[PDB]
Design a protein around this ligand. Structure first.
Ligand SMILES: CCCCCCCC/C=C\CCCCCCCC(=O)O[C@@H](COC(=O)CCCCCCCCCCCCCCC)COP(=O)([O-])OCC[N+](C)(C)C
Ligand SMILES: CCCCCCCC/C=C\CCCCCCCC(=O)O[C@@H](COC(=O)CCCCCCCCCCCCCCC)COP(=O)([O-])OCC[N+](C)(C)C
Ligand SMILES: CCCCCCCC/C=C\CCCCCCCC(=O)O[C@@H](COC(=O)CCCCCCCCCCCCCCC)COP(=O)([O-])OCC[N+](C)(C)C
Ligand SMILES: CCCCCCCC/C=C\CCCCCCCC(=O)O[C@@H](COC(=O)CCCCCCCCCCCCCCC)COP(=O)([O-])OCC[N+](C)(C)C
Ligand SMILES: CCCCCCCC/C=C\CCCCCCCC(=O)O[C@@H](COC(=O)CCCCCCCCCCCCCCC)COP(=O)([O-])OCC[N+](C)(C)C
Ligand SMILES: CCCCCCCC/C=C\CCCCCCCC(=O)O[C@@H](COC(=O)CCCCCCCCCCCCCCC)COP(=O)([O-])OCC[N+](C)(C)C
Ligand SMILES: CC(=O)N[C@@H]1[C@@H](O)[C@H](O)[C@@H](CO)O[C@H]1O
Ligand SMILES: *[C@@H]1O[C@H](CO)[C@@H](O)[C@H](O)[C@H]1NC(C)=O
Ligand SMILES: *[C@@H]1O[C@H](CO)[C@@H](O)[C@H](O)[C@H]1NC(C)=O
Ligand SMILES: *[C@@H]1O[C@H](CO)[C@@H](O)[C@H](O)[C@H]1NC(C)=O
Ligand SMILES: *[C@@H]1O[C@H](CO)[C@@H](O)[C@H](O)[C@H]1NC(C)=O
Ligand SMILES: *[C@@H]1O[C@H](CO)[C@@H](O)[C@H](O)[C@H]1NC(C)=O
Lengths: 203, 205, 150, 43, 110, 151, 150, 150, 150, 150, 150
């Protein structure tokens, strides 16, 4: 592997700096200089909030587009000898496209609750406002990344069902139940996402 | 030059403070109060309060914009729970005009009590990130400390302790801009990894 | 009450309970369900019977769902910092073990159904191993509920 | 008067802005390039 | 706990020295019962006995430490038998003690 | 009213990421499918104009990132607040990573599609229906970024 | 009492006790469960006798669960810093050595069931090396208990 | 007395004496345990003869267990910084050299057991190389003790 | 005396001298131990004759042992910062150079005993190469001894 | 005098002069020592003649040893920070150039004795390249020696 | 005079001008040295007329030796930070360009001497490309020499 040596050469190196930077903050006295409080407070509540709206739709469709091309190559691959697959097995495309709907439904919801203010001090920016910031990041993270994983889930099973239906016509309606449990995780993403943004209000 | 100190009556010293340039602006004029402070060796420091939780540093000068005008560094030493330490804070900076008070807010001049703060620009005239901010925005008073080091509540042997600088490897402008640039470098290196990996075929028929 | 930044670790615990369990339910169904369509071509009889590894992996997904409901409802604006750190480890305990249960399910769920297509005597033993993979998802749940409810 | 601190200038983040990530930017484009010429294909 | 560590380590080390003493003395009675290559062979004979008995006598220290492993888990096993089952307020004496004493019967021997 | 001087970095970075990440995906759809046109045309040279349908569907992904990049660049102004600038950065990632995603989806399906369409012409209406579901994912990147930038 | 963030270490000691022992028990289930199906096709007799490594992978899962519920019972607001580090080293030592015992079970548990289909003499020798791959997880437990009592 | 963070390093000395020694004990048992399977398919008589590599990897585990109870019993609230850094280097010395010694055992364990399968004259030579491989773990132990005495 | 944090560098001189030197001596045993078992199938006469690279690599371990106790005996509470850096620089100079000598013994110890089975005239020349591959660690001694004594 | 930590770069310059030089000498001894084993079974005569690269690589180690002692003899408590940076720049310039010199003698010492086995005309040619490969470390002295004199 | 740390960048430039330049000469010696031994087997006539690329690669090392002793003789305590930065860029731009120079000499010196033994018409053309590969290092001088004298 050539290009994998770059990421595995940086991740070991960056962790090796942060290890020895870590045993040189404690060992002198300089743990007061670390300040995870100053990192979460002084930056913004908007950098977390606006990233979460972006990661809500974008990381869902990067699983939805991932789910399409895995089984879309297997539709046209088996479709050469068995052309009857092109009508029945398009629901495998839909279940790896309805995951993108779960993002865009959520992404409008999280953007509906973001509102500006005038404060610039982390004591003026109250805990009602900072909690509104991270909750958009967390709910945008769990509707984006979980939809990525259920997007690749139904796509891989969709590629296998396109190959199994090429050999036998009666099989595809039996393997379709596997794609339901794969696409059920997309349903499990949005229930968390609205619940993390239920009690949230900015201002 | 040397520093002003508030030496105490009992067998100890107390708070002390240093700069190189010390200047004050009222309206438009700028006065250099650094020969009148650090070399002058005589100061009307009227009430140099100390109580081990609250100290006060007053500087009067009697030759200024018109009249006798007094500065007040109001410090504190609380107990903060989330680190379980004693964190001193410069609470306010007050300039005393004809009667009225200037009321400069100065957060993040803080530090742990055991050490001494030191900054380079503790000026007024908020531009992006200067430490001193007035309460009202078109304020008549302004000031500048082109060097700075102040200590309260743990002075020993008439000398400063270890420094707590305001400088920092990271400031909160560069520490969001990095975390977004490092965020979408990673999006790029997923996109660049796939485009760097589409070989063509060798033979054609 | 608690500090202003305190709710951050409770939010990150609420998401990490869901995403890492979703990753386990992903590989638990994709790697095993590849073997289910693999099995069906040579033996189309056990196709409705051998969908038990893809439904046990679905229980990994609802393991991370309930603790996400438990945590995100227990959130409030400005909670105490001690209560939020517990909800952070509550998300990681069920998430990474649910992530671990998915790698346990999808390997032996794929390996079991290939031998089922060659000899169906394995089917009593294969489902027994999937119970031992499922307690790995179950053990993460009971540590998450004993941590978040304190 | 004793033990006056070391006078760090006010643009310390700004130095760590433009010295650390530049030297590593440049460090890579050395190494990824030096890798690409080290094992070439003369065949 | 600290006193047992200092005493049982040295007495076991002398016990391993005593076991090596009875073993090396049997080599002289077995030899009594019946230059260049002799130097390199007896060097391998002697110094592998030298550094070798150290690893032997270090592996005699385990039989107290394995008993320390024996002691600690037996209390935890014991703790469950004496604490989770028997300290139930209402429904103890029936189904609660029966499954725990069965764990005290069957799960400790394995 | 006036914000920090570094506040306009994020909305500018949202404008660039709307065009960088969209062009990276749309270049994948033209290269991966355009390679499949070359392997197709040697044996079945008739359906060459018929097979620029996956290439032109990757071209809509490029103008999907262009329109939102215009709306952000017209909304730029000196001294914009941190709420206003971050709304366009989240607008940029919503359209950028979606176009980078759907750029891959048209690319692999359009590659495998025109290799299979040449050996069976019945798959053409089936291939073009999958590319509809792939290219509509880029349209989902618009109407969240169009809501975010207008807000 | 101690600092506010003191309880964060004891929470991470509770999480790393579980998620590393679960990751160890998963690989010992996965790598050995792949070997069960390869053995059962040729020798379907020893199929309930060959599930000795997969339950011995399961005992690594309960080894973490003992330490995990022990820490969650000892967690409290305002614990001192010296108490919280001891639970971090408790969960790390029972976790990563349980991950080591999970790795050691899967390699020889797979190698044992690939050989016992070819020779019944190894079935007594297979269970010997699996015990030495199990006591590594037991050594992590007895030092986790001695680190969490103090 | 010492600072509050000083007890963290001594606890890290207790864990790293365990998990690094456990990783070497796991790798030495697994790498040499695979060779027992390939040896048994032709020479099943040397099954009990071939347990001597995997038990010498077991010495590496109890080498870590001996040091781990020494560091855990010298732990106390408010130990000095000179006391704690002695215990951290004590844990790294027995663990990481034990990780090296466990690596050297498993390589000559896999090579020697396959080698003594084809010819039983290697058994007096294979045990000789394993002794030099084992004693590296002892060299970490004796410097782990004399660092922990002071 | 000196600062409170000064002992950590002198500990790291004591530990890394015992890790890295035993890390190289493990590789020199493992790589050459594979070479012993490979030639023993054809040429069983040279087994006592061919364990010269294993006992030459064993000196590399006791090279790190002698500098470890010499550094640990010099350890006092609150030593000066100049004295502690001398022990860290000594420990790195013997461990990593011993890690180099552990590499060089392992390669030619593997390849040389492959050739001494097919042609026994290499036996004079093979050990003659190993002297140059052993004195590299011996140069690491006389820089570590001169640095720790200052 | 300078700061108390000023001796840190000086002792590290003494280490890097020893490590990277002996690391270079190890690669020249091992990689070219691999070439001795393949040629000696074919052409058994030229073996005392073919140990010229392993003794030319041995000069690279004492190239690093000389500047190691010369730096270590010049160490004092509280040397100036200017004087310590020269010794760090001395040791890096001799070892890393010597490590590069080990890369040169490693390859051409391997390939040179590969072709000397098939044609003895190469021995005047191969030994001519080795002088150009060894002089790089000899160039490394006169920059390191000229640096530590200041 | 400048700051106390100002001497560090000048001695880094005095080392990086020697490390990287010798590293370029190392690859040029090694990669072309392998082509020498592959040429001498087929055509034994050209050995002095084949070592033109290695002796041109030796100039790359003497290219670095010029600026190394030049910077070290312009080096002083209390040099300005403006003065110290120039010798750093003088150090990097002659070594890394010489490293780029030896990369080109190594590649075309490898394939050039292969085709020279197969057809001697290449020999006049092989040198002509080698001159263009070498004057890249000559452009390294006139940036380093123009920077050091400022
Ligand atoms: C600080 C310490 C850092 C040290 C860290 C690691 C040290 C080890 C480094 C080794 C890296 C080698 C990478 C490589 O081989 O070339 C890669 C190109 O890579 C690119 O395309 C450029 C990547 C841009 C990175 C820019 C970094 C700075 C960004 C602001 C890929 O090579 P390839 O042409 O794809 O051939 C591979 C062969 N294969 C296809 C069969 C797999
Ligand atoms: C390869 C990687 C190696 C390259 C690394 C390079 C780092 C070199 C940069 C050091 C520059 C000075 C830093 C410093 O603060 O000095 C400090 C000395 O402490 C040291 O300098 C120790 C150096 C730590 C290196 C650790 C690597 C060891 C790896 C095995 C002095 O600290 P102070 O001024 O006294 O402030 C403390 C005061 N207080 C205690 C009151 C808080
Ligand atoms: C995860 C993170 C977890 C972090 C846990 C939260 C930190 C506590 C939050 C508050 C805080 O620290 O701020 C306090 C700084 O206090 C410190 O001194 C921090 C001490 C080091 C923090 C430990 C970092 C551990 C991260 C290691 C793990 C790394 C693994 C990375 C992956 C300051 O708060 P304060 O005392 O209230 O001061 C306010 C007073 N003041 C305004 C004047 C300043
Ligand atoms: C393995 C080799 C790596 C080896 C690395 C060795 C480095 C160790 C040197 C640390 C010594 C400094 C020290 O004593 O403490 C100082 C803190 O300074 C720090 O300790 C932190 C500085 C580095 C953090 C920057 C991020 C690193 C990311 C890396 C990403 C790389 C990814 C590449 C891919 C004390 O600070 P202070 O007392 O407050 O005063 C000075 C600060 N001030 C002037 C700003 C106020
Ligand atoms: C390689 C180049 C690496 C460059 C690394 C340098 C990054 C930081 C540069 C400026 C840092 C800075 O001074 O902050 C300034 C803005 O800071 C920013 O917001 C700029 C962020 C730029 C990110 C890099 C973009 C690369 C895009 C790639 C995407 C690919 C797709 C603001 O300053 P301040 O801190 O807010 O003011 C406090 C005053 N004080 C500092 C005196 C205290
Ligand atoms: C090489 C690449 C790394 C270069 C990064 C150095 C940063 C330069 C720098 O900013 O200097 C800074 C530190 O001044 C020093 O103390 C210099 C420290 C250099 C450490 C290099 C050692 C690596 C050797 C590895 C060999 C391993 C071999 C082992 C086997 C000076 O800048 P400053 O912040 O203004 O310092 C003032 C603070 N002061 C007053 C306390 C001094
Ligand atoms: C190092 C330090 O800050 N010590 C402080 C001082 C302070 O003046 C005193 C009040 O009694 O309390 C000590 O603990
Ligand atoms: C700051 O003080 C210095 C004293 O050294 C003085 O020379 C300078 O004029 C002052 N700054 C301004 C802007 O007047
Ligand atoms: C010092 O300032 C106070 C402030 O009211 C004033 O009353 C007093 O007279 C001043 N003393 C001198 C000596 O200037
Ligand atoms: C110290 O003095 C201040 C003066 O305002 C007062 O508020 C505070 O209560 C005093 N504290 C003690 C302990 O005397
Ligand atoms: C105080 O009042 C006098 C008289 O009106 C005026 O000249 C002077 O400027 C005033 N001082 C300040 C600081 O405004
Ligand atoms: C400014 O100072 C006033 C003094 O009354 C204080 O009440 C207020 O909280 C301060 N505001 C800030 C932002 O520091």
């Amino acid at each position: 592997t050539g290009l994998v040596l770059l990421y595995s050469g940086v991740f070991v190196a960056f962790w090796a700096c942060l290890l020895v930077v870590g045993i040189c903050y404690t060992i002198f006295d300089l743990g007061f200089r670390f300040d995870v409080a100053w990192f979460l407070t002084e930056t913004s509540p908007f950098m977390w909030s606006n990233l979460g709206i972006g990661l809500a739709i974008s990381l869902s469709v990067v699983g939805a587009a991932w789910g399409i091309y895995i089984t879309g190559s297997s539709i046209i691959g088996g479709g050469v000898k068995a052309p009857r697959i092109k009508t029945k097995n398009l629901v495998s495309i839909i279940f790896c496209e309805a995951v993108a709907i779960y993002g865009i439904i959520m992404a409008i919801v999280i953007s509906n609750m973001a509102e500006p203010f005038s404060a610039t001090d982390p004591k003026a920016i109250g805990h009602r406002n900072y909690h509104a910031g991270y909750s958009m990041f967390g709910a945008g993270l769990t509707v984006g990344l979980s939809n990525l994983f259920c997007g690749v889930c139904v796509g891989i099973v969709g590629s296998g069902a396109a190959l199994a239906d090429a050999q036998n016509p009666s099989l595809f309606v039996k393997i379709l139940i596997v794609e339901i449990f794969g696409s059920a995780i997309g349903l499990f993403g949005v229930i968390v996402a609205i619940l993390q943004t239920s009690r949230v209000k900015m201002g | 030059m040397n520093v002003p100190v508030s030496y105490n009556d009992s067998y100890d010293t107390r708070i002390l403070f240093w700069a190189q340039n010390f200047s004050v602006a009222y309206g438009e004029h700028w006065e250099d109060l650094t020969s009148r402070t650090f070399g002058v060796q005589d100061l009307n420091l009227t009430g140099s309060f100390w109580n081990d939780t609250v100290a006060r540093l007053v500087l009067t000068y009697d030759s200024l914009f018109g009249t006798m005008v007094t500065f007040k560094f109001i410090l504190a030493n609380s107990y903060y729970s989330v680190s379980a330490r004693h964190w001193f804070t410069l609470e306010n900076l007050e300039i005393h005009s004809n009667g009225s008070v200037a009321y400069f807010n100065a957060s993040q001049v803080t530090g742990p009590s055991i050490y001494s703060f030191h900054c380079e620009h503790v000026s007024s005239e908020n531009e992006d990130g200067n430490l001193l901010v007035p309460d009202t925005q078109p304020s008549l008073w302004q000031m500048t400390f082109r060097d700075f080091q102040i200590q309260a509540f743990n002075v020993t042997d008439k000398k400063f302790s270890y420094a707590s600088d305001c400088a920092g490897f990271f400031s909160p402008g560069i520490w969001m801009g990095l975390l977004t640039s490092l965020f979408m470098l990673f999006i790029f290196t997923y996109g660049l990894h796939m485009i760097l990996s589409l070989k063509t075929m060798d033979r054609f028929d | 009450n608690g500090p202003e930044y305190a709710s951050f670790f409770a939010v990150m615990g609420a998401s990490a309970a869901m995403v890492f369990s979703a990753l386990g339910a992903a590989y638990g169904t994709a790697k095993s369900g590849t073997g289910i369509a693999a099995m069906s071509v040579m033996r189309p009889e056990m196709i409705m019977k051998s969908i038990i590894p893809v439904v046990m992996a679905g229980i990994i997904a609802i393991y991370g769902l309930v603790v996400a409901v438990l945590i995100a409802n227990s959130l409030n604006d400005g909670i105490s910092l001690y209560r939020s750190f517990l909800q952070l480890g509550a998300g990681l305990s069920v998430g990474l073990s649910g992530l671990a249960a998915g790698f346990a399910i999808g390997i032996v769920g794929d390996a079991g159904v290939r031998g089922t297509a060659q000899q169906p005597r394995l089917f009593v033993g294969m489902i027994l191993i999937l119970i031992f993979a499922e307690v790995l998802g179950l053990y993460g749940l009971i540590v998450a509920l004993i941590l978040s409810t304190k | 008067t004793y033990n006056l601190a070391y006078k760090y200038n006010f643009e310390y983040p700004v130095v760590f802005n433009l010295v650390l990530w530049i030297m590593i930017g440049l460090a890579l484009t050395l190494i990824v390039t030096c890798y690409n010429i080290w094992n070439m294909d003369p065949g | 706990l600290t006193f047992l560590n200092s005493f049982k380590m040295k007495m076991s080390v002398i016990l391993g020295i005593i076991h090596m003493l009875f073993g090396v003395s049997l080599s002289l009675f077995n030899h009594t019962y019946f230059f260049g290559d002799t130097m390199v062979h007896q060097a391998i004979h002697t110094i592998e006995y030298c550094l070798g008995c150290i690893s032997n006598t270090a592996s005699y220290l385990r039989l107290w430490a394995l008993s320390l492993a024996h002691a600690q888990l037996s209390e935890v096993l014991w703790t469950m038998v004496i604490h989770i089952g028997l300290k139930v307020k209402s429904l103890a004496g029936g189904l609660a003690l029966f499954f725990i004493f069965a764990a005290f019967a069957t799960l400790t021997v394995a």
